[PDB]
Amino acid sequence: SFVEMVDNLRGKSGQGYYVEMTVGSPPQTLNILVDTGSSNFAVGAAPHPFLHRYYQRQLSSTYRDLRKGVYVPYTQGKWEGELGTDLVSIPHGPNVTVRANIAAITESDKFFINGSNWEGILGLAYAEIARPDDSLEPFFDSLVKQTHVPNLFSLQLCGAVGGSMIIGGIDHSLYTGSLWYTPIRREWYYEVIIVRVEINGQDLKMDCKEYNYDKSIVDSGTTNLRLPKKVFEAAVKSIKAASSTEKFPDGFWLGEQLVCWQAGTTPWNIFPVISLYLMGEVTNQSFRITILPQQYLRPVEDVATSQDDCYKFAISQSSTGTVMGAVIMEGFYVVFDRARKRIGFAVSACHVHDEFRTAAVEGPFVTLDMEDCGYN
Numbered sequence: 001s002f003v004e005m006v007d008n009l010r011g012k013s014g015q016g017y018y019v020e021m022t023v024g025s026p027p028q029t030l031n032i033l034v035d036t037g038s039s040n041f042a043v044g045a046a047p048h049p050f051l052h053r054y055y056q057r058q059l060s061s062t063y064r065d066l067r068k069g070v071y072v073p074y075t076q077g078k079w080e081g082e083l084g085t086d087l088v089s090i091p092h093g094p095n096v097t098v099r100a101n102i103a104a105i106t107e108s109d110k111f112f113i114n115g116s117n118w119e120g121i122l123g124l125a126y127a128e129i130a131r132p133d134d135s136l137e138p139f140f141d142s143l144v145k146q147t148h149v150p151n152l153f154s155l156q157l158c159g160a161v162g163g164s165m166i167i168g169g170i171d172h173s174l175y176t177g178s179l180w181y182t183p184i185r186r187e188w189y190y191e192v193i194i195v196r197v198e199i200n201g202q203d204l205k206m207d208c209k210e211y212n213y214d215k216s217i218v219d220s221g222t223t224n225l226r227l228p229k230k231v232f233e234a235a236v237k238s239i240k241a242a243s244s245t246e247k248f249p250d251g252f253w254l255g256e257q258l259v260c261w262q263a264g265t266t267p268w269n270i271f272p273v274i275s276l277y278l279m280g281e282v283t284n285q286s287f288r289i290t291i292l293p294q295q296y297l298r299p300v301e302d303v304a305t306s307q308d309d310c311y312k313f314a315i316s317q318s319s320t321g322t323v324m325g326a327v328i329m330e331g332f333y334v335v336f337d338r339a340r341k342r343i344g345f346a347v348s349a350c351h352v353h354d355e356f357r358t359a360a361v362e363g364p365f366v367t368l369d370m371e372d373c374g375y376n
């Protein structure tokens, strides 16, 4: 029955991927952003300039008020609202209905995106980071407790825009090759441990603790690859060196300004591949995922005279650890195997294409002392 969930996502990396859901009785349809970087299920519940519809609690006969407030601050953006519960379904998901916690968003700050086509957010991470505290059961925990849906989901994010969220399993038609698994270090964010970084085959040769300072997470709700300061500087220095035969606007490397080239003349060959080595399932063993420049040069429309191919640099500096965002997940099939406390990666069936290079998931590799790469 997973074929019913193939192609159930819409959206893009820059504005997120969303799945259709219904809340309440009678069902109210809403588009919900898929966010593995948080653990609250929340929906716009009051008028907002960027919302075309919102959750109307007074129209749902199964709505229950929890008489408790809530607010969630993200890396960028935040909202506040009122907690309650209601019946929730996923039309192109498992054929079930669950009573779930819902934060009714009443005010927000730089959270909703104009023209994104989504009205709420589905935090798929663990209760430890739920607000106001870990006693607010997240949606996926409610789903597993109330139904026989297995305790895992997988995401196929396809760039360009859509993809698939397979709830309760793995759909083998969505990937090629083998799945390689990295342990979930701790159940709060989807925290992983990066054990080596290479750019065009050259090791960054940093203390691997730097790659996970102060954590590394997998986050479908973040567009970019985000790197801690020291790692970001080394990566940008290496990427600049590899591409120095081209001139880039002021602020391109800050992700602010955009770069353009005549239609179909983007010099892909001058931008390096990035290899992230992740801790494996067995002692002293890792695997690597290889990222092409078509992933970290995010294509954007040219509102001006749309003739050229324009892009933004989709790697940015972080002060809260590494974030493997949507541009990293695109082109891979990512399995959030909560039951076995592991995350799997495989080459996606909707993978990015370069003329001479290819995104890859490869292993095994030997990596000694991987335990020292985790931050404490």
Ligand SMILES: CCCCNC(=O)[C@H](C)C[C@H](O)[C@@H]1C[C@H](C)CCc2cccc(c2)CS(=O)(=O)C[C@@H](C)C(=O)N1
Binding pocket: 013, 014, 015, 016, 017, 033, 035, 036, 037, 038, 039, 072, 073, 074, 075, 076, 077, 111, 121, 129, 130, 131, 219, 220, 221, 222, 223, 224
């Ligand atoms: C309180 C406990 C949990 C908190 N979790 C977090 O804050 C996560 C680490 C980050 C989250 O996934 C958040 C979730 C965001 C706001 C959802 C809206 C969205 C979708 C796609 C792209 C962008 C924004 C632009 S963007 O710039 O990429 C935002 C990135 C920077 C962002 O904040 N994404």
